[PDB]
Amino acid sequence: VKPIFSRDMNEAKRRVRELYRAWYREVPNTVHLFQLDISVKQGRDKVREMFKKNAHITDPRVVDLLVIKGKMELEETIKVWKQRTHVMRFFHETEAPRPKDFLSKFYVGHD
Amino acid sequence: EYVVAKLDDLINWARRSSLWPMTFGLACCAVEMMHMAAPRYDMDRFGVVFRASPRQSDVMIVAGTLTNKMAPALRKVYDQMPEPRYVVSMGSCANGGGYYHYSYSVVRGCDRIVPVDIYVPGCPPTAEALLYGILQLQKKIKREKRL
Amino acid sequence: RPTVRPRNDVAHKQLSAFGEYVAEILPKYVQQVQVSCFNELEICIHPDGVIPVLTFLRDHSNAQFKSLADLTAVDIPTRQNRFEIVYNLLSLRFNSRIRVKTYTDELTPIESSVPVYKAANWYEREIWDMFGVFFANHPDLRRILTDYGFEGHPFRKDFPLSGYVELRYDDEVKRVVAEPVELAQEFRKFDLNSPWEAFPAYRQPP
Amino acid sequence: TYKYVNLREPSMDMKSVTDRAAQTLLWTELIRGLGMTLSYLFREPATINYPFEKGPLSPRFRGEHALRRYPSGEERCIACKLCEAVCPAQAITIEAEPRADGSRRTTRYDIDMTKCIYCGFCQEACPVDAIVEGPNFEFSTETHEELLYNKEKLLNNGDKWEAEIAANIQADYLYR
Amino acid sequence: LIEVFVDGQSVMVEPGTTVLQACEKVGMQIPRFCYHERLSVAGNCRMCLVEIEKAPKVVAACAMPVMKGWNILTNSEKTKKAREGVMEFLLANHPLDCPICDQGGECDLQDQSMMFGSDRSRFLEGKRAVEDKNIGPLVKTIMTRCIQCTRCIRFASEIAGVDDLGTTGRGNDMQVGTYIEKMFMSELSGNIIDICPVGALTXXXXXXXXXXXXXXXXXXXXXXXXXXXXXXXXXXXXXXXXXXXXXXXXXXXXXXXXXXXX
Amino acid sequence: XXXXXXXXXXXXXXXXXXXXXXXXXXXXXXXXXXXXXXXXXXXXXXXXXXXXXXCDGGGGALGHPRVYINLDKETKTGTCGYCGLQFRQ
Amino acid sequence: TGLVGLAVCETPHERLKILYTKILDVLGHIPKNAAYRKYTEQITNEKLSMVKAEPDVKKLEERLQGGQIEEVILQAENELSLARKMIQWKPWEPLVEEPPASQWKW
Numbered sequence A: 001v002k003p004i005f006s007r008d009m010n011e012a013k014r015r016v017r018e019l020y021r022a023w024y025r026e027v028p029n030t031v032h033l034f035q036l037d038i039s040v041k042q043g044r045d046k047v048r049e050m051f052k053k054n055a056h057i058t059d060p061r062v063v064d065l066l067v068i069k070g071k072m073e074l075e076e077t078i079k080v081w082k083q084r085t086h087v088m089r090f091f092h093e094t095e096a097p098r099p100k101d102f103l104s105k106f107y108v109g110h111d
Numbered sequence B: 001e002y003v004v005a006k007l008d009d010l011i012n013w014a015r016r017s018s019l020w021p022m023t024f025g026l027a028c029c030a031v032e033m034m035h036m037a038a039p040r041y042d043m044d045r046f047g048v049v050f051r052a053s054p055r056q057s058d059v060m061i062v063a064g065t066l067t068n069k070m071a072p073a074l075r076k077v078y079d080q081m082p083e084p085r086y087v088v089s090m091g092s093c094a095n096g097g098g099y100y101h102y103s104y105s106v107v108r109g110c111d112r113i114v115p116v117d118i119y120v121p122g123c124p125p126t127a128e129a130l131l132y133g134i135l136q137l138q139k140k141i142k143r144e145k146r147l
Numbered sequence C: 001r002p003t004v005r006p007r008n009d010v011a012h013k014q015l016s017a018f019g020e021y022v023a024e025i026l027p028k029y030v031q032q033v034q035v036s037c038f039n040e041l042e043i044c045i046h047p048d049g050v051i052p053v054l055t056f057l058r059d060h061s062n063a064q065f066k067s068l069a070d071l072t073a074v075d076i077p078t079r080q081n082r083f084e085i086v087y088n089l090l091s092l093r094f095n096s097r098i099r100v101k102t103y104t105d106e107l108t109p110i111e112s113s114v115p116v117y118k119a120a121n122w123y124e125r126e127i128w129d130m131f132g133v134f135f136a137n138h139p140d141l142r143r144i145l146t147d148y149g150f151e152g153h154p155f156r157k158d159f160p161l162s163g164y165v166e167l168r169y170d171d172e173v174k175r176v177v178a179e180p181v182e183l184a185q186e187f188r189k190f191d192l193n194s195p196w197e198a199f200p201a202y203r204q205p206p
Numbered sequence D: 001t002y003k004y005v006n007l008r009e010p011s012m013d014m015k016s017v018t019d020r021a022a023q024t025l026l027w028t029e030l031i032r033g034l035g036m037t038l039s040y041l042f043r044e045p046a047t048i049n050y051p052f053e054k055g056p057l058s059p060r061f062r063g064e065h066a067l068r069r070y071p072s073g074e075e076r077c078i079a080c081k082l083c084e085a086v087c088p089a090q091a092i093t094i095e096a097e098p099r100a101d102g103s104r105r106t107t108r109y110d111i112d113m114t115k116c117i118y119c120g121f122c123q124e125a126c127p128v129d130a131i132v133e134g135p136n137f138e139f140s141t142e143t144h145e146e147l148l149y150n151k152e153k154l155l156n157n158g159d160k161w162e163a164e165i166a167a168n169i170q171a172d173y174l175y176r
Numbered sequence E: 001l002i003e004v005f006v007d008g009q010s011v012m013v014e015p016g017t018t019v020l021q022a023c024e025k026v027g028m029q030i031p032r033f034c035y036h037e038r039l040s041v042a043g044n045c046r047m048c049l050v051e052i053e054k055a056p057k058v059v060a061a062c063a064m065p066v067m068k069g070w071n072i073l074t075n076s077e078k079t080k081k082a083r084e085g086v087m088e089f090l091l092a093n094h095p096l097d098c099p100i101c102d103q104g105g106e107c108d109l110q111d112q113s114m115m116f117g118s119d120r121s122r123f124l125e126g127k128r129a130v131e132d133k134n135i136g137p138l139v140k141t142i143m144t145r146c147i148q149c150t151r152c153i154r155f156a157s158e159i160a161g162v163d164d165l166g167t168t169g170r171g172n173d174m175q176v177g178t179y180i181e182k183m184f185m186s187e188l189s190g191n192i193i194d195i196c197p198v199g200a201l202t203x204x205x206x207x208x209x210x211x212x213x214x215x216x217x218x219x220x221x222x223x224x225x226x227x228x229x230x231x232x233x234x235x236x237x238x239x240x241x242x243x244x245x246x247x248x249x250x251x252x253x254x255x256x257x258x259x260x261x262x
Numbered sequence F: 001x002x003x004x005x006x007x008x009x010x011x012x013x014x015x016x017x018x019x020x021x022x023x024x025x026x027x028x029x030x031x032x033x034x035x036x037x038x039x040x041x042x043x044x045x046x047x048x049x050x051x052x053x054x055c056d057g058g059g060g061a062l063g064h065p066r067v068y069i070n071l072d073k074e075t076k077t078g079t080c081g082y083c084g085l086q087f088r089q
Numbered sequence G: 001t002g003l004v005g006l007a008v009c010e011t012p013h014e015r016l017k018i019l020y021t022k023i024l025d026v027l028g029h030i031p032k033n034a035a036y037r038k039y040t041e042q043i044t045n046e047k048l049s050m051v052k053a054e055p056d057v058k059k060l061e062e063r064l065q066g067g068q069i070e071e072v073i074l075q076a077e078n079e080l081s082l083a084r085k086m087i088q089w090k091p092w093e094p095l096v097e098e099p100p101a102s103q104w105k106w
């Protein structure tokens, strides 16, 4: 069909599963080889919240592009690349962070 | 009382004599930084030595443009430097992004990564104007550790 | 005209022969649209087969190009199909410049030019970086000009010039260089666009 | 055009082989290379010490920005936003208000030195010739705040360089 | 309806349709100075001169209708020789205000010199200046910058109601002023500054505050005065200073309220 | 003229009960000399012979585009767009 | 004598004749109605006549090459690969692919 991408509907879901195992094994390895930073358990919780935002699945075309991107930004650790605890860090350290409420945001006055 | 005030100037004279800068080739500014070596305008062995080295050097010149890729890279160089360290932001890109600025990749100000003591405003920072940056650094060192 | 005209058309009819010669083969698979203006030739190619077009012009008895050197891509949101990957080709034996274009939206993968041209793989990484177009059967697709912790694709007209992650503080944390801060200085949006049409003949009827 | 870099066998037989072998057995050409720097040592060096001697320049040179004025008082800048739009760095900002009564010449006038890549474009785009680039080198600060130029003021303080600017512009009208 | 081809392409038009009105259907805008939207059709400039397929003299677009099936070219050889010439006549007696002038980019005459008129040179020596006309609150009027046309003259007579602007002389001395020293009435005459193509009549409240270059425009309906819709407001960093009338089909007849303009 | 401590130059306000201004405390703030445009009125008005006069700073050397100024009204003298120089008769 | 390129300048005649006769047969396997066979054949036959007439002359190498026989041999070496790829992937013989959307002007 058009266009190919990589997988058709059901096959695209199992490509995410293979991607999930490869990244789950690296988070204990990126403590001793990289840096302690936060925690091994807290690093694994960062994985689950990342896939929840990506969880929609309507077409295999969108899913396949996420796999290629998932084998790049999460690949920035496996083959040993320089980051120095600045790159590949997803969580905000200095975030305020803002909340969504008609009493909290309106008191600060924004938009 | 009199010996205390005069000995402090003698330690400050040691840095007034010689300053070893870092040779960062991260700019068009770096070619003008190579004009400091060019005989017509020289601080070479007047104070400047082009040996550089990441650890032995006292001064580091941030030459021009810095990207978000080089932002963690230049920071770890600053940590390797000894305690008497002076940072010169030679070039308009180093001062706050001469060009680009509003761009996605270029870091604005350099002070967001590494604190700056002496600012040089010039894009093609003329070697004549570059001579001020080292001479002002030598003049700025006045008094260190009273008590 | 003495200073007003750059060059008179003389090789324009000679270059128009190429506009017929490749079109004499007449594939719906390859040819489609042939445009020739200002001593230059432009061809756009159907997404299904890009590699067979690139194997052509390479070698060939009539015209020898070989060098498929420089590789660009166009971002335009006017059409239903978004991106336009543009190949700039040069001949050493023949001494001529021809253009190869793609018309597809290419959010869905497109065929790679790596088996035909060796230096094409480095340019293919840039298109995946800036525009976000994946190349099928590509060896080593790695980020070059983008940051290691960069989200999205930096060139697309859908998002601003400043971006989302751009400002990098140091402040409170001893070693970690900041990322989530988003604010930058105000880029003044110029609304300078001249009234009246600039040139005749370029005007299209609604 | 062809020039050829390859020598294509300099040695042939007996006489041509021995001298090509002599330079590799001992040195000769290294001693000949030693003589190049030897004569280079004796000839006088072209060196300029900055606090006393000064380097060569030109009648038209761009450095630190300074806005000029008319011989009989009056600020020469007319407020157009002309130089604002040409500026490729967008370093120059201008907001204009009427001056007391009648005259309409500026209020906000900031030129960033954190920006500005130095073109002379603002010098060229100006119809009244307000910003004229003077021969400037001396500028060194502790902060960005001290470096970026305020609402005219410090730009108007370029009177110390305006005497040179008036001399330099006399070599500028009907260009060179 | 009779059809007549303009620039080879055929376009259907009404029997009493103007030449410039017929040009709009073919998607081509002729160089204008005397309006076609709402102001009455009048000559008194001869800029919109177009050459027919078989005609010795060029006819004005504002006055002459198409009527019969005749071919008219917009990018003709005679038209380009005309357009470059008339621009030179307009600028032989023009005071040169462009950097100081309140308009700059918004000025219609400024664009037409760049688009149509002769660029390389303009033969001129000695330009006449007119004395400043009296004006009340809105629009700081300068008679020198005025090109002496018929746009604001008919605006006071037809659109505004109360007539004030007219003719004062004969040659290159005729002013567009009121002749007698009297301030202009309010009502709806505040929109007269937006009508004029040249930088002669421009709002005194927002004069020299911001140029046309570097100003972000946004369309919004006015709160003050009922039945007011579509009015462009220029941001130009932080606080909005200039508000101009935006084109509307039914809500407003391309004229802002005097209370809303200030 | 100066308000409290800081001197006003080319129409500028210092601070409302000292809140905004804090940086100019250790270092002295800049001030343009004679920025009140007193030198504009100090120059004497030149007499005109013709109905319209052309203005120039100092030929093509000094930056002044040529503007013609009309003299018709007896009250209030006419001045050019670039200069504060006034003309009568 | 040696060529400037990495390809070794070997004194070999009729080597060009074998490769140019081989490619003519490959073209007459699958495409027949296509213009690709009809146009490429008459250029190759024109070049083969120059080789038969001129015996090891530099003027024969100067015709449509002018970079010796080594550059002309490279043109024949990749010609067999180009003909086989054109025979495998149908494009010249068949035309049935969909047309693009109506937009071109910028």
Ligand SMILES: NC(=O)c1ccc[n+]([C@@H]2O[C@H](COP(=O)([O-])OP(=O)(O)OC[C@H]3O[C@@H](n4cnc5c(N)ncnc54)[C@H](OP(=O)(O)O)[C@@H]3O)[C@@H](O)[C@H]2O)c1
Pocket (backbone or CB within 6 Å): none
């Ligand atoms: N972890 C703990 O130790 C701990 C536990 C409980 C509570 N705290 C509280 O947290 C605070 C920690 O601060 P710290 O000890 O980290 O500060 P610090 O390192 O002593 O730094 C204070 C600085 O202020 C200057 N300074 C202070 N008093 C001065 C004077 N009279 N004259 C001149 N210079 C003076 C000193 O400069 P010079 O050196 O040049 O004079 C010094 O560099 C304390 O105030 C304490 O109440 C700390």
Ligand code: SF4
Pocket (backbone or CB within 6 Å): B027, B028, B029, B063, B064, B065, B090, B091, B092, B093, B094, B098, B099, B122, B123, B124, B125, D117
């Ligand atoms: S300031 Fe100018 S010379 Fe220096 S790096 Fe930036 S663009 Fe290059």
Ligand code: SF4
Pocket (backbone or CB within 6 Å): D076, D077, D078, D079, D080, D081, D082, D083, D084, D094, D125, D126, D127, D128, D129, D130, D131, E099
């Ligand atoms: S510097 Fe010149 S161009 Fe810029 S606003 Fe002033 S007068 Fe106009």
Ligand code: SF4
Pocket (backbone or CB within 6 Å): D086, D087, D088, D089, D090, D091, D092, D111, D115, D116, D117, D118, D119, D120, D121, D122, D123
């Ligand atoms: S020199 Fe260039 S960058 Fe600097 S203010 Fe002038 S136009 Fe802007």
Ligand code: SF4
Pocket (backbone or CB within 6 Å): E094, E096, E097, E098, E099, E101, E102, E103, E104, E105, E107, E108, E109, E110, E145, E197, E198, E199, E200
């Ligand atoms: S009316 Fe238009 S062309 Fe004439 S000076 Fe004013 S802006 Fe320039």
Ligand code: SF4
Pocket (backbone or CB within 6 Å): E146, E147, E148, E149, E150, E151, E152, E153, E176, E195, E196, E197, E198, E200, E201
């Ligand atoms: S003021 Fe404007 S609209 Fe009125 S006559 Fe003059 S140019 Fe025409």
Ligand code: FES
Pocket (backbone or CB within 6 Å): E031, E032, E033, E034, E035, E042, E043, E044, E045, E046, E047, E048, E060, E061, E062, E063
């Ligand atoms: S624009 Fe038609 S007569 Fe003036």
Ligand SMILES: [Zn+2]
Pocket (backbone or CB within 6 Å): F055, F056, F057, F064, F080, F081, F082, F083
């Ligand atoms: Zn003047």
